């Protein structure tokens, strides 16, 4: 029979089992097609996918970060063009921007799932600090005042940091700055996506406001030396009062309770990111699916992508992974009325903003990760006292690099 291979990026402790649970109805209905997933770590995925495209040794299908689709699709003869092959009228319209190469009419990926980053908070810590989560995180200024109340108060048998966020180089370095830049009134690029603009006065204002939360002692400075994975685990172990995280962590914390009784899942809530002077904006990300032009089973590969876009598969994928569907009909299922999941859906719908879907963006994220993390080294006073002037110089240099890539 036809043996389809596909690469997936992990966001759970059992990536392959989860995937096989979703595709079992497809293999049942199509007995002559089998699906075998192979996990590729996030840090290695961009290089591994790029090498697969240029060399011609690839699986049939791979997951791709939504923000990388245009970079891979723009590579001569790398991907099967999907424009006209997938019925996109059933998708959440906003999810389609990252499936195309901006400015062209060429679609090289299919939207698979969506995610955003929301504000997790500890209900018990807020009660002790006199913070009302419903209202006190609503704006930048209220958020900062709430962190001041939370900072260093003893909950149970430890002093909690008010906000825990990672600072080490991973792909989330830029994502975690994005909505602060947006909320300040700035953007990474011009409307056309051909010019970097995050050294504007407003972009710098958002960068300054967020990074100086750590200067002012409201962020756990030691956590800035760690990556997203470590902060997610630390929050699940009760280390912080608040953290901005994606919805998949809810699955981790639920499993922690089942496996050892860690009750952390029972004393957290989630609210939308605080509103800045520009209005409310949120990070919109997720992943798409692509078919390698080197595939010798392109017919079956397209059948499988269409399955992943089916309502039933979209609903089941969200339940197992906690990611958000990209297909409108999936939200008819009552599972999405859950008090935590509804926050993520409302936030990405009303306020979600995705990066420009341009071929150079994937390369830009490499530079963003290496460049913007130097801001956290400035805050940590590794090499000299903190200085906003140094942050400005870092951002100017990064902007010059990104302009050259674009």
Ligand X SMILES: OC[C@H]1O[C@@H](O[C@H]2[C@H](O)[C@@H](O)[C@H](O)O[C@@H]2CO)[C@H](O)[C@@H](O)[C@@H]1O
The DSSP call for residue 355 is: P
* CA 381 vs CA 226, 317, 356: distances in Å: 16, 43, 33
Rule CB under 6 A: say whether 66 interacts with ligand X: yes
Tracing tokens 């490499």 back to the chain, one arrives at 366
Provide DSSP, 220-264: -GGGGGS-HHHHHHHHHTT-EEEEEE-TTHHHHHHHHHHHH--GG
Q: Check the CA dihedral 334-88-298-363 and report its sign.
A: negative
For residue 69, how many C-alpha atoms fall within 13 Å in the half-sphere facing its CB? 34
The DSSP call for residue 100 is: B
Which is it for strands 158-159 and 154-155: parallel, antiparallel or unpaired? Answer: antiparallel
CB of 245 within 8 A of CB of 164? no
Closest distance to ligand X from the beta carbon of 217 (Å): 27
| Residue from 285, 352, 359, 360 binding ligand X (CB under 6 A) | 285
| Residue from 68, 140, 143, 308 binding ligand X (CB under 6 A) | 68
Select 117 or 122, whichever has its Cβ closest to ligand X.
Answer: 117
Rule CB under 6 A: say whether 292 interacts with ligand X: no
Q: Which residue is nearest to ligand X (CB)?
A: 65
Closest distance to ligand X from the beta carbon of 141 (Å): 29
| Residue from 62, 67, 88, 373 binding ligand X (CB under 6 A) | 67
Closest distance to ligand X from the beta carbon of 354 (Å): 8
| Residue from 5, 7, 11, 183 binding ligand X (CB under 6 A) | 11
CB of 175 within 8 A of CB of 285? yes
| Residue from 365, 371, 374, 376 binding ligand X (CB under 6 A) | 365
Structure tokens at 398: 């990064």
Closest distance to ligand X from the beta carbon of 52 (Å): 17
Select 5 or 66, whichever has its Cβ closest to ligand X.
Answer: 66
CB of 290 within 8 A of CB of 311? no
Question: Which of these, 343, 337, 326, 316, lies nearest to 289 by C-alpha position?
Answer: 326
Q: How far apart are CA 335 and CA 328, in angstroms?
A: 14
Binding mask 18-47 for ligand X (x = CB under 6 A): ------------------------x-----
- Which one of the spans 64-72, 129-137, 153-161, 338-346 is the region binding ligand X (CB under 6 A)? 64-72
Q: How far apart are CA 367 and CA 269, in angstroms?
A: 34
100 bridge partner residues = 107
Select 19 or 155, whichever has its Cβ closest to ligand X.
Answer: 19
Select 164 or 285, whichever has its Cβ closest to ligand X.
Answer: 285
39 bridge partner residues = 8
- Name residues contacting ligand X, limited to 123-182 (CB under 6 A): 170-172
- Which one of the spans 60-68, 79-87, 334-342, 386-394 is the region binding ligand X (CB under 6 A)? 60-68
- Which one of the spans 59-67, 152-160, 272-280, 327-335 is the region binding ligand X (CB under 6 A)? 59-67
- Which one of the spans 65-73, 124-132, 189-197, 308-316 is the region binding ligand X (CB under 6 A)? 65-73
- Name residues contacting ligand X, limited to 73-102 (CB under 6 A): none
Closest distance to ligand X from the beta carbon of 393 (Å): 25
Rule CB under 6 A: say whether 228 interacts with ligand X: yes
Question: Which of these, 51, 175, 49, 186, lies nearest to 118 by C-alpha position?
Answer: 175
CB of 12 within 8 A of CB of 247? no
Q: How far apart are CA 39 and CA 62, in angstroms?
A: 10
Select 71 or 315, whichever has its Cβ closest to ligand X.
Answer: 71
- Which one of the spans 61-69, 147-155, 270-278, 333-341 is the region binding ligand X (CB under 6 A)? 61-69
Select 65 or 193, whichever has its Cβ closest to ligand X.
Answer: 65
Residues in binding contact with ligand X, number by CB under 6 A: 15
Q: What are phi and psi of 47, to 5 degrees?
A: -65, -40
Where on the chain is the footprint of ligand X (CB under 6 A)?
11, 42, 65-68, 115, 170-172, 228, 246, 285-286, 365
């Amino acid at each position: 029979s036809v043996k389809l291979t596909m690469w997936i990026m992990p966001n759970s402790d059992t990536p392959d089992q989860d995937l096989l649970k979703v595709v079992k109805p497809f293999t049942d209905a199509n007995p002559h097609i089998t699906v075998e997933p192979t996990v590729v770590d996030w840090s290695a995925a961009l290089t591994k996918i790029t090498a697969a495209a240029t060399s011609g040794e690839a699986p049939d299908i791979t997951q791709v970060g939504s923000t990388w689709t245009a970079a891979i699709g723009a590579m001569e003869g790398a991907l099967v063009e999907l424009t006209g092959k997938i019925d996109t009228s059933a998708f959440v319209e906003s999810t389609l921007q990252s499936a195309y190469i901006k400015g062209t009419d060429k679609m090289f990926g299919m939207p698979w799932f969506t995610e955003t980053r929301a504000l997790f908070y500890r209900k018990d810590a807020c009660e002790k600090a006199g913070v009302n989560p419903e209202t006190d995180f609503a704006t930048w200024d209220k958020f900062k005042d709430a962190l001041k109340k939370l900072n260093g108060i003893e909950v149970d048998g430890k002093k909690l940091a008010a906000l825990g966020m990672p600072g080490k180089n991973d792909w989330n370095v830029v994502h975690n700055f994005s909505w602060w830049i947006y909320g300040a009134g700035g953007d990474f690029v011009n409307e056309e996506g051909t010019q970097a603009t995050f050294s504007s006065e407003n972009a710098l204002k958002g960068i300054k406001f967020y990074s100086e939360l750590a200067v002012e002692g409201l962020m756990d400075e030691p956590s800035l030396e760690k990556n997203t994975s470590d902060i997610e685990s630390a929050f699940g172990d009760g280390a912080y009062a608040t953290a901005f995280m994606g919805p998949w962590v809810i699955s981790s914390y639920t499993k922690n309770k089942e496996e050892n009784g860690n009750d952390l899942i029972d004393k957290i809530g989630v609210t939308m990111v605080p509103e800045g002077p520009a209005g409310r904006y949120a990070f919109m990300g997720g992943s798409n699916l692509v078919i390698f032009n080197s595939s010798k089973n392109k017919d079956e590969a397209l059948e499988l992508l269409k399955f992943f876009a089916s309502k039933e598969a979209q609903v089941e994928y969200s339940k197992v992974s906690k990611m958000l569907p990209v297909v409108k009909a999936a939200y008819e299922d009552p599972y999405f009325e859950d008090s935590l999941m509804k926050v993520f859906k409302e936030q990405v719908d009303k306020y979600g903003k995705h990066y420009a879907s341009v071929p150079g963006w994937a390369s830009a994220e490499v530079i963003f990760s290496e460049g913007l993390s130097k801001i956290w080294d400035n805050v940590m006073e590794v090499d000299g006292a903190y200085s906003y002037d140094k942050t400005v110089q870092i951002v100017k240099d990064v902007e010059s690099q990104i302009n050259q890539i674009l």
